[PDB]
């Protein structure tokens, strides 16, 4: 109904008379598709200084909360995730650490064969681990794949 001009006869020339007006997309270049069906993506990027696992969990929980108000038909699908890999890495590292402590206990009782002497290193390694974690936090480091290795 935008009036381009009004003729002297009372006739009007509107924007719809010389063009077709529709509500489309600003950029038609992208044609994102998911599993053969048209879809739109939403990539979330971590802010430095926060846990990526916890951030991903919170994002998924919030999107699940938002999923209650989705119009019929619309569903959110995760097409790319890094939480599983980093969780598996942390689990493997902590498993190796605990298994190494257990094997230290086993070998100590195999050679020295004293339960208390066996306890002596079993209690000395964890305090060094705590000190190392404290130093890493002081230096501004964080639990990475490299630091855990």
């Amino acid at each position: 109904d935008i009036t381009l001009r009004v003729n002297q006869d009372g006739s009007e020339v509107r924007l719809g008379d010389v063009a077709t007006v529709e509500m489309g997309a600003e950029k038609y270049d992208y044609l994102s598709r998911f599993n053969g069906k048209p879809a739109s993506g939403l990539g979330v990027k971590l802010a430095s200084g926060a846990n990526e696992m916890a951030t991903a969990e919170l994002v998924l929980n919030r999107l699940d909360e938002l999923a209650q108000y989705f119009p019929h038909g619309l569903e959110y699908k995760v097409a790319y995730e890094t939480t599983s890999f980093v969780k598996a890495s942390i689990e493997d590292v902590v498993k190796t650490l605990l298994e190494a402590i257990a094997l230290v206990f086993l070998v100590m009782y195999l050679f020295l064969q004293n339960f208390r002497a066996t306890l002596i290193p079993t209690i000395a390694v964890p305090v060094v681990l705590m000190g190392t974690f404290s130093v890493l936090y002081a230096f501004g480091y964080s639990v990475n794949t490299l630091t855990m290795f």
């Binding site: 290193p121 000395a124 060094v128 681990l129 890493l136 480091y141 490299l146 630091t147």
Partner: protein, 49 residues
């Protein structure tokens, strides 16, 4: 402790992304070594006694 530090410290001073990758390991291992040596001379003798 000193020779182990000399083993691990120099990799920290490498330049670039590989330098930072090496620096992570260097700092972690050096901190752990220093803490263990301090614990070895303080906590462990008390436990053994």
């Amino acid at each position: 402790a000193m020779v182990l530090s000399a083993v691990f410290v120099p990799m920290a001073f490498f330049g670039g992304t590989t330098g930072a990758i090496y620096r992570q390991f260097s700092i972690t291992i050096v901190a752990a070594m220093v803490l263990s040596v301090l614990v070895a001379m303080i906590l462990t003798p008390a436990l053994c006694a």
